Amino acid sequence: ASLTEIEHLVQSVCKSYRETCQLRLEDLLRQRSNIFSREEVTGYQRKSMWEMWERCAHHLTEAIQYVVEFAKRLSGFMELCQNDQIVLLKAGAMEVVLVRMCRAYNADNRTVFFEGKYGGMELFRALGCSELISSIFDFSHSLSALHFSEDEIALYTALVLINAHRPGLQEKRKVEQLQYNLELAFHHHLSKTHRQSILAKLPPKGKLRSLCSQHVERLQIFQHL
Numbered sequence: 001a002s003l004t005e006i007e008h009l010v011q012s013v014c015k016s017y018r019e020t021c022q023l024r025l026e027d028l029l030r031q032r033s034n035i036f037s038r039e040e041v042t043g044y045q046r047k048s049m050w051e052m053w054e055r056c057a058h059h060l061t062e063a064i065q066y067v068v069e070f071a072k073r074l075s076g077f078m079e080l081c082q083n084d085q086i087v088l089l090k091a092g093a094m095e096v097v098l099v100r101m102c103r104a105y106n107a108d109n110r111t112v113f114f115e116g117k118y119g120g121m122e123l124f125r126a127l128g129c130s131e132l133i134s135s136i137f138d139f140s141h142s143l144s145a146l147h148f149s150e151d152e153i154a155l156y157t158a159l160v161l162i163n164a165h166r167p168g169l170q171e172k173r174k175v176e177q178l179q180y181n182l183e184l185a186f187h188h189h190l191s192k193t194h195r196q197s198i199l200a201k202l203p204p205k206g207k208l209r210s211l212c213s214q215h216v217e218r219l220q221i222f223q224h225l
C-alpha cells in the first residue's frame with residue numbers, strides 16, 4: 001500500500017469512529033461537572049433491579065448498534081462473507097463496547113456518564129452486580145491512564161474487531177489482509193504522532209476477553225430472567 005492509501009485509511013477509520021459515537025467527546029467532557037446529587041443517587045438505588053436492567057439494557061442495545069455500524073464502515077468488512085462478518089461481531093462487538101466506555105469515565109472522581117449526569121458505582125446498586133461493575137470501572141480506569149486520543153481509540157477499536165485469529169473464520173486470509181492494513185495504519189499514525197509508547201501499554205487481550213466473557217455471561221442471565 002502507498003503512503004496516501006495508508007493516510008486515507010487512517011482518516012476513514014477515525015471518521016467512522018467519530019460518526020458512530022452515541023455522544024460526542026466534547027459533550028461527555030462538558031458534562032463532567034454535572035454530577036448526580038445525593039438525592040438523585042438515592043433515587044436510582046431505590047429502583048427495582050428490573051427497571052435498572054431495562055435502563056442499562058437500553059443503553060447497551062444502542063451501544064452495540066453503534067458498534068455494528070462502525071464495523072460496517074470499516075474498509076473490506078462488508079465484502080467479507082456473512083459468516084465471517086458474524087464471527088468478528090460475536091467475538092468483538094462487546095469488547096469494543098467495553099473499550100468505548102472509557103470515553104464516559106472520569107478518573108478524577110471515579111464516576112461514569114449515565115442518563116444525563118455523572119455518578120459513581122453506587123448508582124447501580126439495585127443490579128446486585130458490584131463485583132462485575134467494579135471490574136468494568138477498573139478497566140476504564142486503566143484505559144483512562146493511557147490518555148487515548150480520539151484517533152488512537154478509533155484505530156485500536158478497529159483492530160479489536162478486525163482480528164484474523166478469531167476461531168471459525170472461513171476466509172482467514174482475507175481478514176489477515178484487512179488486519180495487516182489496519183495495523184500498518186495504526187503503527188504509521190503512532191510513529192507520526194510520537195505515540196508508539198502506547199503499544200506496550202494496551203490492555204492484555206486475555207484481560208479484555210475475560211472481562212467481556214464475564215460481562216456477557218451476566219447480561220445473558222438478566223435476559224433470561
Ligand SMILES: Cc1ncc(C(=O)Nc2cn3ccnc3c(CN3CCN(C(=O)C4CCCC4)[C@@H](C)C3)c2C)cn1
Nearest residue numbers: 060061062063064065068069089090091092093094216
Ligand atoms: C441494518 C441493520 N439491521 C439490524 C441490525 C442489528 O440487528 N443489530 C444488532 C443490534 N443489537 C443490539 C444489541 N444486540 C444486537 C444484535 C444481536 N447481537 C447478538 C450477538 N452480539 C453479542 O455481543 C453477543 C454474541 C455472543 C457474545 C456477545 C452482538 C453482535 C449483538 C444485533 C444483530 C443492524 N443493522
Ligand SMILES: Cc1ncc(C(=O)Nc2cn3ccnc3c(CN3CCN(C(=O)C4CCCC4)[C@@H](C)C3)c2C)cn1
Nearest residue numbers: 022023056101102104105112113114129136137140218
Ligand atoms: C450516551 C452515553 N455514552 C456512553 C456511556 C457510558 O459508556 N457510560 C459508562 C461508562 N462506564 C465505564 C466504566 N463503567 C461504565 C458505566 C457503568 N455501567 C454499569 C451498568 N452496565 C452494565 O452492563 C450492567 C448491566 C447488568 C450487568 C452490568 C454498563 C452500561 C456499564 C457506564 C454507564 C453512557 N451514555
